[PDB]
């Protein structure tokens, strides 16, 4: 005689709920798998890659259950520009009597510590092995900088391929090669379309996929047939994620930083502004233990041009009002997870795609903006993403002086001009600010066929720093 809502509240209470994070715990002892961290933040970032019009977000909603907005009326159907964020909790069940493959269970961010076992007849409770975040990268030919930024923030990969379509999909190859560029060898291949398939056709496509991945960097990548609409083979992907992907080294010794990819103004309309909030920047902490009430500055920040034409950068200092992660407001942030840093920053500053690929540093560190940067570049033999109708995939030409090139350092989408080209190094001038922290893997893309085309990889070697104006 109980409502579903009263029920859910009951088994949420019986599951231990969602405990509040402590104000000040012992950080020298915390691991990304402490029960304190896993319940209220994601420690592993997983990205999704695939061909256009494939349904990457559909697999994400099958796994977690949180939608990816898909906004802007026009972009409600075709393609979205920003990333796709959803939170999944990997619940294993402690009873070994039930079969291992259906033990694993992925649930939304709102799930409890120990909710009951949905399998009929099993009295076990789920234990949360890890909370993970999901980034749905774009899948189109024009949007490339956001994809590469997502790959840079990615820690694990999920490749999606459809079966009955043509076997050599070049968008998938471009995604995998870009993931290879930014030091990611943890990829799980996913066969999206298996229901409308024959027994021999699936085997032939599997053979084709296995033949495809022989000469690339990634060798031992698993392949899983999942159904995005039928909502099955969900536990298999979760157990594969648990097994093959370990934790990249990210501890508390490394200095704190932030890399903002998305911005979120907080200006709830219609109500009086006497009750208002700040402005949220969606950024990832690849290194750093950030807490509530800390000083931070956006390194490239305010971009201005004087009467002489010189580019001036005013780093945007700001006091962190709040940090948003997982579901509840959290006191201290765990590196290895997208976080909304909600600060006293201006409402307009976070309005549009403005804080897309910028570098932010806490008070107590000085990242350097650079105006001219020396890069060490390497490049492939043929472009990926060009469907040649039976003729020798376009072979890439060597770079030329005075060429506009889209250079993605980390997450920043900058247009560099070539000053010098050499055998294995090059010199780039940035009309848009970029900053150099430590190593910061880079990707290079050219204008060859109308739209952007990835060519190779690069690393920052030298540069001409610009001292910020106080």
């Amino acid at each position: 005689g109980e409502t579903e809502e009263e029920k859910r509240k009951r088994e949420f209470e019986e599951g231990g709920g969602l405990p509040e994070q402590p104000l000040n715990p012992d950080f020298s002892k915390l691991n990304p798998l402490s029960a304190e961290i896993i319940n209220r933040q994601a420690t592993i970032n997983i990205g999704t890659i695939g061909h256009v019009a494939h349904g990457k977000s559909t697999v994400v909603r099958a796994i977690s259950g949180v939608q990816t907005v898909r906004f802007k009326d026009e972009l409600e159907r075709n393609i979205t520009i920003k990333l796709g964020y959803a939170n999944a909790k990997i619940y294993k069940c402690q009873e070994p009597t039930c079969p291992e493959p259906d033990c694993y269970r992925s649930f939304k961010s709102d799930k409890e510590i120990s909710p009951k076992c949905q399998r009929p007849g099993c009295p076990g409770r789920y234990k949360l092995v890890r909370h993970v975040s999901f980034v749905d990268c774009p899948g189109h030919d024009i949007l490339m900088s956001t994809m590469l930024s997502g790959a840079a923030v990615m820690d694990a990969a999920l490749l999606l391929i459809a079966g009955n379509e043509s076997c050599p999909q070049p968008q998938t190859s471009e995604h995998l090669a870009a993931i290879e560029i930014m030091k990611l060898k943890h990829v799980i291949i996913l066969q999206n379309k298996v229901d409308l398939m024959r027994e021999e056709s699936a085997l032939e496509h599997q053979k084709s996929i296995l033949k495809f991945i022989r000469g690339t960097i990634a060798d031992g990548a698993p392949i899983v047939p999942i159904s995005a609409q039928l909502k099955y083979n969900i536990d298999a992907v979760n157990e594969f994620i648990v097994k093959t992907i370990p934790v990249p080294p990210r501890d508390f010794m490394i200095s704190p930083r932030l890399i903002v990819i998305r911005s979120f103004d907080v200006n709830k309309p219609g109500a009086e502004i006497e009750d208002l909030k700040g402005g949220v920047a969606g950024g990832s902490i690849l290194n750093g233990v950030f807490k509530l009430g800390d000083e931070i500055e956006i390194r490239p920040g305010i971009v201005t041009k004087d009467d002489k034409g010189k580019i001036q950068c005013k780093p945007i200092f700001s006091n962190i009002v709040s940090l948003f992660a997982e579901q509840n407001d959290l006191k201290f942030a765990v590196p290895g997870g997208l976080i909304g840093v909600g600060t006293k920053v201006d409402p307009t500053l976070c309005r549009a795609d403005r804080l897309v690929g910028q570098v932010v540093g806490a008070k107590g560190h000085l990242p350097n903006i650079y105006t001219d940067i020396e890069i060490n570049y390497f490049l492939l033999r043929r472009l990926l993403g060009v469907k040649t109708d039976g003729q020798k995939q376009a072979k890439v030409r060597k770079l030329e002086p005075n060429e506009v090139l889209m250079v993605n350092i980390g997450s920043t989408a900058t247009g560099a001009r070539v000053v010098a080209v050499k055998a294995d190094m090059a010199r780039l001038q940035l009309t848009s600010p970029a900053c150099t922290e430590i190593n910061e893997k880079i990707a290079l893309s050219r204008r060859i066929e109308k739209h952007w085309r990835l060519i190779g990889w690069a690393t920052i070697k030298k540069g001409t720093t610009l001292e910020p104006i106080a």
Binding site: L203, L210, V224, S227
Partner: peptide, 23 residues
């Protein structure tokens, strides 16, 4: 090695024939 791929594949086909006999 993609041997643990075809087992899930046959599992999916079996559920396909279980749920949708008309297909």
């Amino acid at each position: 090695v993609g041997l643990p791929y075809s087992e899930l594949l046959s599992r999916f086909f079996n559920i396909l024939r279980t749920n949708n006999p008309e297909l």
